[PDB]
Amino acid sequence: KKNYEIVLFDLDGTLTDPKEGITKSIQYSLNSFGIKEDLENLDQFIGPPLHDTFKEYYKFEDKKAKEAVEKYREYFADKGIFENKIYENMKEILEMLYKNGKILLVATSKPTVFAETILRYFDIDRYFKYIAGSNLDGTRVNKNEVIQYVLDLCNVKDKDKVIMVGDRKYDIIGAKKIGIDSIGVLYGYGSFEEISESEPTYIVENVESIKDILL
């Protein structure tokens, strides 16, 4: 069994669930064009780019598609950003890791400002040394790039004591490009099919099981 000293976490689907704010932001946008939808029917739009949702599903023209994105962003910045749910038991495991002296980092494709806002909202920002996401109104940053960035801040030499925790293949692919171990979680947005096919170092069903691998 290996002793990991640096643990990286993705945000959405790993630490916190953004379902409420994302679906409500889409609903608000659709409403702006007179389209009524139940939030349950918008869950499937958590993940793909908004362009695909408005263009491929709602068949909005390129111009109407940008107006839809603007309305989404308006609601998200105002209220959507505060509509997240922390996964049950995550605060406890972060506290346990931190108290054992592990360095905890966030490496996410979500904009940094949003990641920091959310971690601050749940009073868990304090457990992370560095938090790295993408730029607001910028290009979505790839996972290997944000993982490398955050390790470089720690001036890491022994990459064997580093591990990435995430709920999507993108987290595992990122980890493999960097040459670090990974935990693929199943309680987020990645299916067992997806996670198992990405071949992470470990697979966990729930938050509590993270303890068994890291401690």
Which range touches Na ion (CB under 5 A), out of 13-21, 33-41, 135-143, 174-182? Answer: 13-21
Question: Strands 103-111 and 6-9: what pairing?
Answer: parallel
Least distance (Å) between residue 108 CB and Na ion: 7
Token representation of residue 166: 């995430």
Please tell me whether residue 17 binds Na ion under the rule CB under 5 A. no
Whole-number minimum distance, CB 19 to Na ion, in Å?
12
Residue 174 sits in the site that holds Cl ion (CB under 5 A): yes
If binding is defined by CB under 5 A, does position 32 make contact with Cl ion?
no
Residue 97's identity, in one-letter code, is L
3-class SS at 172?
helix
How many other C-beta atoms lie within 10 A of the C-beta of residue 196? Answer: 14
HSE, CB side, 13 Å, CA atoms: give it for residue 115. Answer: 23
The span of 70-78, 83-91, 116-124, 168-176 binding Cl ion (CB under 5 A) equals 168-176
Positions of E strands within the chain = 6-9, 16-17, 85-86, 103-111, 130-134, 162-166, 181-185, 202-204
The DSSP symbol for 53 reads I
Q: What is the C-alpha to C-alpha distance for residues 121 and 112, in angstroms, rounded to an integer? A: 14
Q: Is 144 in the site for Cl ion (CB under 5 A)?
A: yes
Residues 133, 110: Cα–Cα separation, whole Å: 5
Whether 10 is catalytic is yes
Residue 167 interacts with Na ion (CB under 5 A): yes or no: yes
Binder of residue 144, out of Na ion, Cl ion, none (CB less than 5 to 8 A by kind): Cl ion
Among 32, 142, 148, 201, binds Cl ion (CB under 5 A): 142
The C-alpha atoms of residue 129 and residue 142 are separated, in whole angstroms, by 21
Nearest residue to 124 via CA among 92, 99, 88, 166: 92
For Cl ion (CB under 5 A), the number of binding residues is: 5
Residue from 10, 12, 17, 167 carrying the catalytic annotation: 10
Interaction between residue 12 and Na ion (CB under 5 A): yes
- Choice from 24, 102, 110, 143 touching Cl ion (CB under 5 A): 143
Binding site for Cl ion (CB under 5 A): 142-144, 173-174
Binding site for Na ion (CB under 5 A): 10, 12-13, 167
Residues belonging to the active site: 10
